[PDB]
Design a protein around this ligand. Structure first.
Ligand SMILES: O=C(N[C@@H](Cc1ccccc1)[C@@H](O)C[C@]1(Cc2ccccc2)NC=C([C@@H]2CNC(=O)c3ccccc32)C1=O)O[C@H]1CCOC1
Lengths: 99, 99
């Protein structure tokens, strides 16, 4: 499927047993989801961009279903304004930028 | 061209006669560049990022070349870690996400 950018590229993902809307973000190295609970151990980390830095929790080997596709990778959790799917997971589903 | 996401999708842009590196950022609605001198007048603009909202300077009808593709649009100048090419300009060059 081809996705134009006239509107934010939002898709439905499945994690921890529930569905969520997320933003496909080529400008993000990793994936960050709103504050939630996840099984396993995590490490503190800080990420920054417009507006400053926020503290998140880094989880490894997390299973996430993006557009009915199973991809596994690093997931950050913190006070982000919106769920973001980063390159670390975009590459796994064979997503590319074209023009 | 088709750009894979294993690495950051950086491209060279041409603005004001000089070359610069920028990131193709589908997660950004707007285009934000690091501090620089742009012609004409500006108006205040409040944008929301990962770390909160900030005020930036907005310049309209700016000629920007992206990968040899000419575009004319709104460019915002403010504190940012990288030059960001958002959806407003990505749509002008016919960029899409495919998988
Ligand atoms: O700020 C954004 N867009 C956010 C996404 C977003 C969308 C809506 C609301 C909040 C955030 C994102 O796409 C932009 C950016 C820019 C950046 C590139 C490389 C390193 C540092 C900053 N890319 C990744 C991260 C962040 C932080 N820094 C990171 O390094 C990182 C790593 C993993 C996930 C997310 C990120 C960013 O802040 O949009 C603004 C301005 C343009 O239009 C509106």
């Amino acid at each position: 499927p081809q996705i134009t950018l006239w509107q934010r590229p939002l898709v439905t993902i499945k994690i921890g047993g529930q569905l969520k809307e997320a933003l496909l973000d080529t400008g993000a190295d990793d994936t960050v989801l709103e504050e939630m609970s996840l099984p396993g151990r995590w490490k503190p980390k800080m990420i920054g961009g417009i507006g400053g830095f926020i503290k998140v929790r880094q989880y490894d080997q997390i299973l996430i279903e993006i557009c009915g596709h199973k991809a596994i990778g690093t997931v950050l959790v913190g006070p982000t304004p919106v769920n973001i799917i980063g390159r670390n997971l975009l590459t796994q589903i064979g997503c590319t930028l074209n023009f």
